[PDB]
A = this chain, B = another copy of it.
Amino acid sequence: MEGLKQLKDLPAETPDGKKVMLAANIGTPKDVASALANGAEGVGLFRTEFLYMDRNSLPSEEEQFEAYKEVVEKMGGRPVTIRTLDIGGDKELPYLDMPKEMNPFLGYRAIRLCLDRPDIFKTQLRAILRASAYGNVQIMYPMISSVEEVRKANSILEEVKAELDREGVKYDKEIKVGIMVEIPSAAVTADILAKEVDFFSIGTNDLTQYTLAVDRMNEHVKEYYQPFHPAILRLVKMVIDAAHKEGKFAAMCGEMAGDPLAAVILLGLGLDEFSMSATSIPEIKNIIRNVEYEKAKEIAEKALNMSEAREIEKMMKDVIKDI
């Protein structure tokens, strides 16, 4: 159990040899310095909303390319998982002419908006592909409910690769493309999805809201938001096993991956990559390095055996005290 300075370049590896990747969640190129300072082994989630927010026009391909390239370069070969536009009309960005909706979190947002406006989508995919020439880039589509949507998005991505091929512009021909798991059907169908994605990243904040049908930002029902509800851990297990079966990796970029309480459970379920606010890295690292993977599997099994979030919460608190 050690200090930050010492932990920085030590691996997140249990005493019995299981290693996991601890990576950072960022929302602007400026977040990279902190990320490296805490020993981030990649970016598990580069949110790209910053390029569309606080302005009255679409970000140009050039502008996005520069921001993506910056991060990719600075991470020095470490994987950078760029999530495509994941914005809905709940965010007032007038130039996007979003429709006024009763339930925006259930509406025309993210991948749905991108599929309906392939022009916007193409511009972003071209910037990401161009940036992949300079480092280790993965693409993550959000808001995916079905393998049919992944097919539609990849057909647009293939269209963009071919323009780039025509133009003599370089990109990583082997670029990895996965999806964020947040719509419940994506976890319920991960076996079907796992055949056509390169990885999954579990957006647990969003998955919890959809699965428990709760808007966590609604003050009148915030208590219904319970990430430790057994349904959430069951969906996570489903997603991880399904990735693994097809030989693909499972990451988690939801808040839960940076929560000390969840660490041993995640480790035991076999999560491959934990992605989180950079300052959380050392804390989860200390946990993984001090808990045997065999014992973590056992803890995850016990947690999976429980019927109530609060019992799971209480047990994890005990596990973390025991150290």
Q: Mark A59-75, 1 if CB is under 8 A from B, else 0.
A: 00000000000000000
Contact of A231 with B184 in the complex, beta carbons under 8 Å: yes
Between A108, A213, A226, A309, the greatest number of chain B beta carbons within 10 A of the residue's beta carbon is seen for: A213
Shortest CB distance A32–B (Å): 31
In this assembly, does A90 line the interface, its C-beta being within 8 Å of a C-beta of chain B? yes
Known A-B contacts A101-B215, A112-B221; the reply to A147 vs B308 at CB < 8 A is: yes
Segment of A44-52, A131-139, A204-212 in the binding face? A204-212
Contact of B147 with A107 in the complex, beta carbons under 8 Å: no
Q: How far is the CA of A167 from the CA of B242 in the complex (A)?
A: 57
Q: How far is the CA of A210 from the CA of B189 in the complex (A)?
A: 15
Contact of A229 with B185 in the complex, beta carbons under 8 Å: yes
Shortest CB distance A228–B (Å): 11
List B contacts of A105 (CB < 8 A).
Answer: 102-103, 106, 213
Chain A 135-184 interface residues, beta-carbon cutoff 8 Å to B: 143, 145-148, 182-184
Partner of A214, one of B106, B219, B231, B310: B106
In this assembly, does A27 line the interface, its C-beta being within 8 Å of a C-beta of chain B? no
Shortest CB distance A254–B (Å): 15
In this assembly, does A319 line the interface, its C-beta being within 8 Å of a C-beta of chain B? no
List B contacts of A188 (CB < 8 A).
Answer: 184, 211, 230-231, 234-235
List B contacts of A6 (CB < 8 A).
Answer: none
Q: How far is the CA of A219 from the CA of B143 in the complex (A)?
A: 18
Q: Mark A74-109, 1 if CB is under 8 A from B, else 0.
A: 000000000000000010000000010111111110
Chain A 269-302 interface residues, beta-carbon cutoff 8 Å to B: none
Q: How far is the CA of A103 from the CA of B219 in the complex (A)?
A: 12
Contact of A213 with B102 in the complex, beta carbons under 8 Å: no
Q: Chain B residue with minimal CB distance to A213?
A: B183
Q: Chain B residue with minimal CB distance to A144?
A: B213
Partner of A218, one of B102, B189, B235, B308: B102
In this assembly, does A220 line the interface, its C-beta being within 8 Å of a C-beta of chain B? yes
Contact of B185 with A231 in the complex, beta carbons under 8 Å: yes
Q: Mark A101-131, 1 if CB is under 8 A from B, else 0.
A: 1111111100010001000000000000000
Q: How far is the CA of A107 from the CA of B186 in the complex (A)?
A: 23
Contact of B103 with A218 in the complex, beta carbons under 8 Å: yes
Shortest CB distance A117–B (Å): 11
Between A101, A219, A234, the greatest number of chain B beta carbons within 10 A of the residue's beta carbon is seen for: A101
Contact of B145 with A229 in the complex, beta carbons under 8 Å: yes
Given contacts A103-B104, A106-B215, A148-B308, could you give 7 more A-B pairs where the C-beta distance is less than 8 Å? A101-B215, A106-B106, A106-B218, A107-B214, A107-B221, A148-B310, A184-B210
List 7 tightest A-B contacts by C-beta distance, closest first: A185-B231, A188-B231, A108-B220, A106-B215, A183-B213, A103-B215, A184-B184
